[PDB]
Amino acid sequence: ITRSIADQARTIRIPVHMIETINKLNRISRQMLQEMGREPTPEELAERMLMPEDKIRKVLKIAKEPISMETPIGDDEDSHLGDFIEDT
DNA sequence: CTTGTTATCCGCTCACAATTCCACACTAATTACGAGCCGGAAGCATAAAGTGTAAAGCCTTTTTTGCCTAAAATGTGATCTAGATCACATTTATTGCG
C-alpha cells in the first residue's frame, strides 16, 4: 500500500524525492524554533543542505495540487475558472 | 370462516432552483529517514562533409561631377511712333408703344 500511493497519488505523475524533500526541511524548521525561538533564515540551512538558496525557491512552485477548473468564482452560475482564460 | 383483489397510506428514491447589468474588497491542511543505485545531460572538445556566410579582389556598367567653348541668347539707354489707362459726363442707337 506504500508502493501504489508512492507515485500514482496525484492526478498528475509526481517524482519520489520531490515529496520526500518537503518533510525533510520540516523536521528541522521547528528544531531551531524550539531552541532559539527565531525563524531559520535561508543562510544557515544553506551550509547543511545541498541546495543554494535561489533554485530552492522555484522548487516549492512545483509542489501544488494545483487547481481544478470547474470551480465557482463570483457569479456562481455560469462563471468558471477555465472560462476566463483568453485563447492565443 | 378464509380468501382474494383493491384502496389508502406511508416512507422512500427519485427528479429537479428562471427578474435583469455592473462596481469595490478578500482567500488553503496532510504519509519516518538514510544508504545505495542507475539515470540523464553539464555542455566538453572533437572532426568531418556538407552547407550557407562573410571579408573585399579587379571588372563592367551607371551616375554626378568638372570641364571647354561653338553657337545662340541677352542688356546698354535715349528717341520715337503706334499703343495703352483711368473716372463717370454726356450722347448715342436698340428693339416697340401708342
CB contact at 8 A, A63 and A22: yes
* Helical residues (DSSP H) of A1-88, grouped into ranges: 17-20, 55-62
Answer for A6: CB within 7 Å of strand B: yes
Place of cell 524554533: A33
Residue among A48, A61, A54 nearest A22 (CA) = A61
Three-point CA angle A6, A11, A14, nearest 5° = 45
Residues 31-50 of chain A sitting with CB below 7 angstroms of strand B? none
For A82, residues 6+ apart whose C-beta sits below 8 A from its C-beta are A69, A70
- Cβ pair A53, A46 in contact under 8 A: yes
Nearest DNA or RNA nucleotide to A67 (CA to C1'): B28
